[PDB]
Amino acid sequence: TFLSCSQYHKMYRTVKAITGRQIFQPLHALRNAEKVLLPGYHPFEWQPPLKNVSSRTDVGIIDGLSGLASSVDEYPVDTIAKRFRYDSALVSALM
Amino acid sequence: MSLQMVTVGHNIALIQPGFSLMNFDGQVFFFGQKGWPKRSCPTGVFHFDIKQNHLKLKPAIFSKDSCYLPPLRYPATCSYKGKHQYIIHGGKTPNNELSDKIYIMSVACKNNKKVTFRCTEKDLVGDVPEPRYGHSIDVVYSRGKSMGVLFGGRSYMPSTQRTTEKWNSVADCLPHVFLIDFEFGCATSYILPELQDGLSFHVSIARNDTVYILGGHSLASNIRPANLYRIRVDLPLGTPAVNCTVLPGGISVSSAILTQTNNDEFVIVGGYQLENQKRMVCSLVSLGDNTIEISEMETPDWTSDIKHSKIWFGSNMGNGTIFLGIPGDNKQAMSEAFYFYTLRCS
Amino acid sequence: SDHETLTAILSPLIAEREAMKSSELTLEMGGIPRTFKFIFRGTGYDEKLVREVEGLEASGSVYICTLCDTTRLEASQNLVFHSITRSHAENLQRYEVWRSNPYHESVEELRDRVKGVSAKPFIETVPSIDALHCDIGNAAEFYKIFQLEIGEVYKHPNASKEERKRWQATLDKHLRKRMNLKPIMRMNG
Numbered sequence: 001t002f003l004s005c006s007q008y009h010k011m012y013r014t015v016k017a018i019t020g021r022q023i024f025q026p027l028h029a030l031r032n033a034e035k036v037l038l039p040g041y042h043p044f045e046w047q048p049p050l051k052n053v054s055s056r057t058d059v060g061i062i063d064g065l066s067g068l069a070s071s072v073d074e075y076p077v078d079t080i081a082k083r084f085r086y087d088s089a090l091v092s093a094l095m
Numbered sequence: 096m097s098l099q100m101v102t103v104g105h106n107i108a109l110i111q112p113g114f115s116l117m118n119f120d121g122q123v124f125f126f127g128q129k130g131w132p133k134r135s136c137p138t139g140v141f142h143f144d145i146k147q148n149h150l151k152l153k154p155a156i157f158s159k160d161s162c163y164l165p166p167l168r169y170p171a172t173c174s175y176k177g178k179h180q181y182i183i184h185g186g187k188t189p190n191n192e193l194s195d196k197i198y199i200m201s202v203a204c205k206n207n208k209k210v211t212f213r214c215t216e217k218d219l220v221g222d223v224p225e226p227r228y229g230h231s232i233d234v235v236y237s238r239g240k241s242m243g244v245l246f247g248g249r250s251y252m253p254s255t256q257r258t259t260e261k262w263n264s265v266a267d268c269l270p271h272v273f274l275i276d277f278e279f280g281c282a283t284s285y286i287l288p289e290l291q292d293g294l295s296f297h298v299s300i301a302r303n304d305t306v307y308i309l310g311g312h313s314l315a316s317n318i319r320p321a322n323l324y325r326i327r328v329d330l331p332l333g334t335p336a337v338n339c340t341v342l343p344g345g346i347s348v349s350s351a352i353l354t355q356t357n358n359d360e361f362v363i364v365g366g367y368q369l370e371n372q373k374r375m376v377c378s379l380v381s382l383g384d385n386t387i388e389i390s391e392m393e394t395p396d397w398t399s400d401i402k403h404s405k406i407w408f409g410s411n412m413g414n415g416t417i418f419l420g421i422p423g424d425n426k427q428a429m430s431e432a433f434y435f436y437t438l439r440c441s
Numbered sequence: 442s443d444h445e446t447l448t449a450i451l452s453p454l455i456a457e458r459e460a461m462k463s464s465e466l467t468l469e470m471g472g473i474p475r476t477f478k479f480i481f482r483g484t485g486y487d488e489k490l491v492r493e494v495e496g497l498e499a500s501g502s503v504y505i506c507t508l509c510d511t512t513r514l515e516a517s518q519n520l521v522f523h524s525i526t527r528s529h530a531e532n533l534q535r536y537e538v539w540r541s542n543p544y545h546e547s548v549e550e551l552r553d554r555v556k557g558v559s560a561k562p563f564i565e566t567v568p569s570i571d572a573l574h575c576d577i578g579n580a581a582e583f584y585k586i587f588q589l590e591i592g593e594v595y596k597h598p599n600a601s602k603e604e605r606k607r608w609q610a611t612l613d614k615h616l617r618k619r620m621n622l623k624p625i626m627r628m629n630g
C-alpha cells in the first residue's frame with residue numbers, strides 16, 4: 001500500500017482507539033517480521049565453500065562499490081550503490 | 096609559467112583522469128581513452144595536436160604487425176630513447192582489472208605527417224612484477240648497458256585474501272625494486288631495507304645512472320612521506336647491483352606531474368599535500384652531477400576555477416609544457432564535463 | 442554506458458556468480474535440509490547492453506546479429522539460413538586474437554578475422570532475442586514503411602527532408618481520424 005511508518009502508525013492507533021481491539025500490529029512488530037524476510041537471516045552453507053566469497057550468513061545490504069578506492073588520488077567516483085551478496089540473496093529468495 | 100585555457104573538439108569525452116601523453120620527435124600522442132576503442136579510431140592512440148589553443152584528437156593507425164593494446168588508465172610510461180620508443184607497464188583496463196603486459200610504442204612509418212605506430216608487446220620471466228598501477232618505471236644507463244628500474248605502486252589484494260565484500264579494495268605493493276632487461280625481457284626483484292613502506296603515485300626521475308623517487312601517497316598508513324630516495328644501479332659484467340639512500344629536502348606530494356624544462360632541470364607541478372590539500376606551489380628539481388637541488392618557482396598564476404575545485408589530472412606534452420584538466424561545474428550544470436588547460440614551463 | 446564504473450560495480454557480482462556456479466547449497470527448508478544446484482542464464486539484457494557487456498561494437502555496425510556473425514549486407518542477399526554461433530568463450534577467444542594479432546593483419550582484415558569484437562567480454566550472456574524491443578522495433582519499422590508507401594516511393598525515389606514530414610503528417614492525421622490513435626513521438630508498446 002506504499003504507506004510510510006508515521007502514516008501506518010496513524011492508522012494503527014486510530015483503528016485501535018476506535019475499535020478497542022488491536023487489529024493492526026505496532027511498528028516494532030513489523031521491523032521484527034521484516035528481519036525475517038530480507039537476506040542475512042537464515043543459516044546456510046555451501047559445499048565446497050565458495051572461492052573468494054565470505055562464509056558469514058548474516059550479510060545484509062552491502063555497499064555496492066565493494067570497497068572501491070575513493071580518494072583524491074584514484075579515478076574519481078561518486079556513484080552511490082547498494083547491493084546484496086549474491087549467495088545470501090539467492091538463499092533468501094529460495095526460503 | 097604562463098597558464099592558458101584550451102578549447103577542445105567534438106571527442107572531448109575521450110579524455111579522462113589517468114591518461115597518457117607520449118611524445119615522438121616533437122609531436123604528441125594521446126593514449127588511454129575512456130571506454131574500449133570505438134569504431135572511429137580502433138586504437139585509442141591519437142594525434143594530440145594543439146594549435147591556437149585548440150586541440151584536435153585525431154586518429155592514428157598502427158603497423159601491420161603491431162598489437163592492439165587496451166586503453167590503460169594508470170600505466171607506467173618511460174621514454175626509452177635507445178630507435179626512440181616508449182615503454183608501457185601495468186594499468187587499469189576499461190574492465191577495471193590490472194595488466195602485467197609490457198608494450199613498446201615505436202614509429203614504423205611517418206609520411207605526410209601520417210604516423211604509423213608499432214605497438215609490439217614483450218612479456219617477462221623470472222621475478223615478474225605483480226600487476227599494479229600508479230607505479231613508475233624508468234630506464235637507467237651504466238657501462239654502456241642499460242636496464243629498467245621499477246618501484247611498485249598499489250595493486251589489488253592477492254588471489255587468496257581477496258573477498259567480494261571488499262573486491263575493489265587496494266593495497267600498496269611490497270617496496271621491492273625490479274630490474275628489467277628489455278632485450279630478453281628478464282626481471283629481477285631486489286629487497287632494499289632502507290625502503291620500508293609501500294608507495295604509489297610518486298614521482299621518479301632518471302639521471303643516467305640513478306633514480307630519484309620523491310613524493311608518493313602511502314596507503315599502508317595514509318600519509319605522504321616527504322623523504323626522497325636515490326637509487327644507484329651498477330651494471331657489472333655478471334649480476335647487476337642496486338643501492339638506496341634517503342636524502343633530505345624531499346617533498347610530501349602525490350599525483351604530481353613532472354617534466355624537463357632545460358637539460359637536467361625538471362619542474363614538478365601540482366599534486367596533493369593532504370586528502371584535501373590541492374597543491375599549488377611548483378618545484379624545480381635542479382639536477383647535478385651527484386646532488387639534487389630542490390627549489391621552487393613563483394607558484395604559477397592559478398585562475399579562480401582552479402582554486403575552487405578539488406582535483407585535477409594531466410601530464411607533460413614533452414617540451415616543458417604541462418597539460419591539466421579539471422572537472423566541470425555541478426551547480427553550473429551547463430558545463431562540458433571537463434575544463435582543460437595547457438601551461439608552458441618555458 | 443559508463444563502462445568503467447559499471448564494471449567496477451558489477452565485477453564482484455560476476456565473481457560470486459562464477460563461484461556459486463560450481464558448488465551446492467545446503468539449506469534447511471522446513472525441517473530437513475536440501476541441496477540446491479544452480480544454473481544461471483543472463484537473458485534480460487536489451488540489445489545495447491548485450492553489445493556493451495559482451496564486448497561488441499555499437500548497433501550501427503556492419504555486423505548486426507549478436508547471435509551469428511553475418512554482415513548487414515549479406516544479411517539481405519540471404520535472409521533465413523543462419524545459425525547461432527556467437528558464444529561467450531568464442532568471444533573471449535576473438536578478443537584475444539584482436540589484442541594479440543598473431544597473424545599480423547591490418548585493422549580492416551583483423552576486424553573481419555574477429556567479427557567486430559574489439560573489447561573484452563565482461564558478463565556472460567546467452568544468445569537470445571528480446572521480445573519486447575523486438576516487437577517495438579518491428580512496429581516502428583512498419584510505421585516508417587507506411588509513411589514510405591504514402592510517399593509512393595516505389596516509383597519515384599529521393600524526395601526531400603520535408604516531403605517525408607508532410608507524408609508523416611498525412612499518416613498521423615488519418616490515423617487519429619480513423620482510430621482516434623493519438624500520435625506519439627516516442628514509440629511505446
Ligand SMILES: [Zn+2]
Pocket residue numbers: 505506507508509510511523
Ligand atoms: Zn543473425
